Amino acid sequence: TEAGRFWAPHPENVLFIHKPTMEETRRVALGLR
Amino acid sequence: HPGFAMTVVRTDEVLAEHILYCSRASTSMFVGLPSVVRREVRSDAVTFEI
């Protein structure tokens, strides 16, 4: 939380996409469209 | 003559030899004890502070 420490090599936020839950919201919403 | 007048300010300093008057017995004084403290001791000199 400092302006000089912006691009830390290990930041506090880590992306986590759970791929089985993502495929089902694709396939349901591609069924409706 | 240009379109404007102007005013000018100097200073001047004067030596003076004053007459300080001091009435009797106003300020009481308190005289302590002098201490001595060494500082900056070299191979060439030993200096003190009183």
Place this chain on the structure above:
Amino acid sequence: ALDKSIVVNLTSRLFADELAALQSKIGSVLPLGDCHRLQNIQALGLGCVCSRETSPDYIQIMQYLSKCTLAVLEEVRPDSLRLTRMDPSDNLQIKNVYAPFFQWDSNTQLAVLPPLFSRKDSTIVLESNGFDIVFPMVVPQQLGHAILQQLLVYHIYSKISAGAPGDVNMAELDLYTTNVSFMGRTYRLDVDNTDLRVLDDLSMYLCILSALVPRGCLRLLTALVRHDRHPLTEVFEGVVPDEVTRIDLDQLSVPDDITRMRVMFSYLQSLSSIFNLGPRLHVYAYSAETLAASCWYSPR
């Protein structure tokens, strides 16, 4: 409670001419090869290592000054000189009689450097004993790390002009090297280009680095790929030149590369310390009219 005094005797009496030059510098810093009070003449200068018959050295003097004991003149009596001893963290007084004259200020850090300038500015020849005492070049640390650097660049381009004329202009080289700006003031140093054999050893070392360093860092980057690589080393791949990254390391074999990497590091620690670590002493008081600086010596 301890007694420190260093009294050097001689074999023959001094001349009347040579006594006036030592009275000119009655406060000084001499190196001195022994710690005991009674001692012969052959150590108290730089004549023990540096001489006219031997080839002049930089590094073998800078190796020597860190190994040597310093001393300060008190009184010059014929023939027995009278120094005083320099102790670790000891407070004493220095007068600054050195040629050429660099202006001292208080709260500066004095660095004893070897004399790389002319002979008559540096030494005082004793004709009675036939031995040369050499006063070291005491220069403030930021000048001493800059009066070396521009003269070491001057020695490089003098070696390029002697090999090929069209690569270097003399007016470009003289204007940007012999004039040294420090503390607002300028100093035009004596070039002595009349024939700088002092700095040939450093000009050999810094060039042999300069070829082997970019050859060396390519192998040391690729040989450290890990899961536990330090995260700052990802940054410095953007610093290395793109021509450096295109080396075919197939050209040099394994029995050649171990010879390089041991030559790689062995110059690096030998060249790092000789820029860093010398006998270096602080100054906390100074007056330009008396030319008297009070100092205290830090041994490193």
Place this chain on the structure above:
Amino acid sequence: PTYGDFLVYSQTFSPQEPLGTFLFSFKQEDNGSSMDMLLTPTSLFMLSGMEAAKAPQTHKVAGVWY
């Protein structure tokens, strides 16, 4: 010890200090006889100009000395 004696403009060295602060001697050129420049770590915070949250406490205090 070996003391040092410094003669400072009263604009730089704030008149009240906790009497044990560490010091520095910035030096650019000898212009006069003896006028010396001294930098406390709270004074060197103000010349820096860094952000507040880098040192959140001394920014308030070094902004009232200066």
